mmCIF file of N, CA and C in Angstrom:
data_model
loop_
_atom_site.group_PDB
_atom_site.id
_atom_site.type_symbol
_atom_site.label_atom_id
_atom_site.label_comp_id
_atom_site.label_asym_id
_atom_site.label_seq_id
_atom_site.Cartn_x
_atom_site.Cartn_y
_atom_site.Cartn_z
ATOM 1 N N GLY A 1 154.982 116.060 62.606
ATOM 2 C CA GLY A 1 155.312 117.102 63.618
ATOM 3 C C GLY A 1 154.691 118.431 63.200
ATOM 4 N N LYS A 2 153.366 118.506 63.267
ATOM 5 C CA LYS A 2 152.658 119.726 62.894
ATOM 6 C C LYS A 2 153.020 120.144 61.472
ATOM 7 N N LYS A 3 153.795 119.308 60.792
ATOM 8 C CA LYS A 3 154.208 119.606 59.425
ATOM 9 C C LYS A 3 153.059 119.359 58.451
ATOM 10 N N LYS A 4 151.865 119.140 58.995
ATOM 11 C CA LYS A 4 150.686 118.893 58.170
ATOM 12 C C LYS A 4 149.600 119.920 58.462
ATOM 13 N N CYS A 5 149.805 120.710 59.510
ATOM 14 C CA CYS A 5 148.833 121.727 59.890
ATOM 15 C C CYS A 5 149.530 123.044 60.207
ATOM 16 N N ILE A 6 149.381 123.498 61.446
ATOM 17 C CA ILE A 6 149.993 124.751 61.876
ATOM 18 C C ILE A 6 150.816 124.538 63.144
ATOM 19 N N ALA A 7 151.524 125.581 63.567
ATOM 20 C CA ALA A 7 152.353 125.501 64.767
ATOM 21 C C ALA A 7 151.812 126.423 65.855
ATOM 22 N N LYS A 8 150.878 127.289 65.475
ATOM 23 C CA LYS A 8 150.285 128.225 66.425
ATOM 24 C C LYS A 8 149.642 127.474 67.584
ATOM 25 N N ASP A 9 149.248 126.234 67.325
ATOM 26 C CA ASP A 9 148.617 125.408 68.348
ATOM 27 C C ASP A 9 147.240 125.961 68.705
ATOM 28 N N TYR A 10 147.223 127.143 69.309
ATOM 29 C CA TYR A 10 145.967 127.774 69.697
ATOM 30 C C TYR A 10 145.993 129.264 69.365
ATOM 31 N N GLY A 11 144.816 129.879 69.323
ATOM 32 C CA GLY A 11 144.723 131.302 69.016
ATOM 33 C C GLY A 11 144.354 131.527 67.552
ATOM 34 N N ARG A 12 145.039 132.471 66.914
ATOM 35 C CA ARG A 12 144.777 132.782 65.511
ATOM 36 C C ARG A 12 144.514 131.508 64.712
ATOM 37 N N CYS A 13 143.272 131.335 64.272
ATOM 38 C CA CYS A 13 142.905 130.156 63.494
ATOM 39 C C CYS A 13 141.822 130.497 62.478
ATOM 40 N N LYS A 14 141.839 129.802 61.345
ATOM 41 C CA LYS A 14 140.849 130.039 60.302
ATOM 42 C C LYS A 14 140.495 128.737 59.593
ATOM 43 N N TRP A 15 139.223 128.362 59.656
ATOM 44 C CA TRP A 15 138.765 127.135 59.015
ATOM 45 C C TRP A 15 139.060 127.170 57.522
ATOM 46 N N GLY A 16 138.959 128.360 56.946
ATOM 47 C CA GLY A 16 139.208 128.539 55.520
ATOM 48 C C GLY A 16 140.634 129.018 55.269
ATOM 49 N N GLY A 17 141.405 129.154 56.341
ATOM 50 C CA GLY A 17 142.786 129.601 56.223
ATOM 51 C C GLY A 17 143.683 128.847 57.196
ATOM 52 N N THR A 18 144.542 129.586 57.893
ATOM 53 C CA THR A 18 145.455 128.988 58.861
ATOM 54 C C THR A 18 144.756 127.865 59.640
ATOM 55 N N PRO A 19 145.013 126.613 59.322
ATOM 56 C CA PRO A 19 144.370 125.470 60.034
ATOM 57 C C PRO A 19 144.498 125.580 61.552
ATOM 58 N N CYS A 20 144.129 124.507 62.244
ATOM 59 C CA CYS A 20 144.199 124.474 63.701
ATOM 60 C C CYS A 20 144.367 123.039 64.189
ATOM 61 N N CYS A 21 145.602 122.542 64.145
ATOM 62 C CA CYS A 21 145.881 121.175 64.582
ATOM 63 C C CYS A 21 145.080 120.837 65.837
ATOM 64 N N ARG A 22 145.420 121.486 66.946
ATOM 65 C CA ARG A 22 144.722 121.245 68.205
ATOM 66 C C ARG A 22 143.766 122.394 68.513
ATOM 67 N N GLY A 23 142.592 122.056 69.035
ATOM 68 C CA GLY A 23 141.596 123.068 69.369
ATOM 69 C C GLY A 23 140.842 123.516 68.124
ATOM 70 N N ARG A 24 139.755 122.817 67.813
ATOM 71 C CA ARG A 24 138.956 123.153 66.641
ATOM 72 C C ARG A 24 137.999 124.300 66.953
ATOM 73 N N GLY A 25 137.934 124.688 68.222
ATOM 74 C CA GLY A 25 137.053 125.775 68.633
ATOM 75 C C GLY A 25 137.510 127.102 68.040
ATOM 76 N N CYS A 26 137.409 127.225 66.720
ATOM 77 C CA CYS A 26 137.814 128.453 66.048
ATOM 78 C C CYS A 26 136.604 129.344 65.801
ATOM 79 N N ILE A 27 136.448 130.355 66.648
ATOM 80 C CA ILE A 27 135.331 131.284 66.526
ATOM 81 C C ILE A 27 135.842 132.713 66.425
ATOM 82 N N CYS A 28 135.075 133.556 65.744
ATOM 83 C CA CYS A 28 135.450 134.955 65.569
ATOM 84 C C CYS A 28 134.393 135.878 66.165
ATOM 85 N N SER A 29 134.784 137.121 66.418
ATOM 86 C CA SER A 29 133.868 138.099 66.988
ATOM 87 C C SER A 29 132.732 138.399 66.016
ATOM 88 N N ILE A 30 131.864 139.327 66.403
ATOM 89 C CA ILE A 30 130.732 139.700 65.563
ATOM 90 C C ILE A 30 131.211 140.304 64.244
ATOM 91 N N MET A 31 132.362 140.965 64.281
ATOM 92 C CA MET A 31 132.914 141.589 63.084
ATOM 93 C C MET A 31 133.623 140.556 62.214
ATOM 94 N N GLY A 32 134.104 139.489 62.842
ATOM 95 C CA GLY A 32 134.800 138.437 62.112
ATOM 96 C C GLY A 32 136.262 138.806 61.881
ATOM 97 N N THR A 33 137.005 138.970 62.969
ATOM 98 C CA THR A 33 138.417 139.326 62.871
ATOM 99 C C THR A 33 139.208 138.708 64.020
ATOM 100 N N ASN A 34 138.542 138.522 65.157
ATOM 101 C CA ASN A 34 139.192 137.938 66.325
ATOM 102 C C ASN A 34 139.036 136.421 66.320
ATOM 103 N N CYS A 35 139.433 135.793 65.218
ATOM 104 C CA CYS A 35 139.328 134.343 65.096
ATOM 105 C C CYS A 35 140.389 133.653 65.950
ATOM 106 N N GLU A 36 139.963 133.113 67.092
ATOM 107 C CA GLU A 36 140.881 132.428 68.000
ATOM 108 C C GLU A 36 140.503 130.959 68.152
ATOM 109 N N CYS A 37 141.516 130.103 68.285
ATOM 110 C CA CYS A 37 141.286 128.671 68.446
ATOM 111 C C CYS A 37 141.205 128.307 69.923
ATOM 112 N N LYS A 38 140.044 127.804 70.340
ATOM 113 C CA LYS A 38 139.841 127.416 71.731
ATOM 114 C C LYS A 38 139.656 125.898 71.840
ATOM 115 N N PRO A 39 140.069 125.297 72.934
ATOM 116 C CA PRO A 39 139.929 123.823 73.133
ATOM 117 C C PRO A 39 138.471 123.407 73.321
ATOM 118 N N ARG A 40 137.668 124.321 73.856
ATOM 119 C CA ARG A 40 136.254 124.047 74.088
ATOM 120 C C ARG A 40 135.524 123.832 72.765
ATOM 121 N N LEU A 41 134.587 122.887 72.762
ATOM 122 C CA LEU A 41 133.827 122.584 71.555
ATOM 123 C C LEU A 41 132.686 123.583 71.376
ATOM 124 N N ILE A 42 131.697 123.205 70.573
ATOM 125 C CA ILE A 42 130.550 124.073 70.324
ATOM 126 C C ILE A 42 129.617 124.084 71.529
ATOM 127 N N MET A 43 129.479 122.930 72.176
ATOM 128 C CA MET A 43 128.610 122.821 73.343
ATOM 129 C C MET A 43 129.086 123.751 74.456
ATOM 130 N N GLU A 44 128.321 124.812 74.700
ATOM 131 C CA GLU A 44 128.675 125.773 75.738
ATOM 132 C C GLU A 44 128.260 125.259 77.113
ATOM 133 N N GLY A 45 128.137 123.941 77.237
ATOM 134 C CA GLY A 45 127.745 123.335 78.504
ATOM 135 C C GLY A 45 127.956 121.826 78.474
ATOM 136 N N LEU A 46 126.918 121.098 78.070
ATOM 137 C CA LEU A 46 126.995 119.643 77.998
ATOM 138 C C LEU A 46 126.524 119.146 76.636
ATOM 139 N N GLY A 47 125.261 119.407 76.320
ATOM 140 C CA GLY A 47 124.701 118.980 75.045
ATOM 141 C C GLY A 47 123.377 119.682 74.771
ATOM 142 N N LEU A 48 123.370 121.003 74.917
ATOM 143 C CA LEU A 48 122.163 121.777 74.680
ATOM 144 C C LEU A 48 122.135 122.279 73.240
ATOM 145 N N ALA A 49 123.265 122.802 72.776
ATOM 146 C CA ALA A 49 123.357 123.312 71.411
ATOM 147 C C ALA A 49 122.830 122.278 70.419
#
């Protein structure tokens, strides 16, 4: 029961810190502070990246 990851589910997430059970889309702003967990993957479309 999330007892192996986090409870935030989405939003504040850090690959090197606060894990992200659901939504691996953990990206931060240019400054690297607005690290939010999004459900969307790396592909900003279909499979171009």
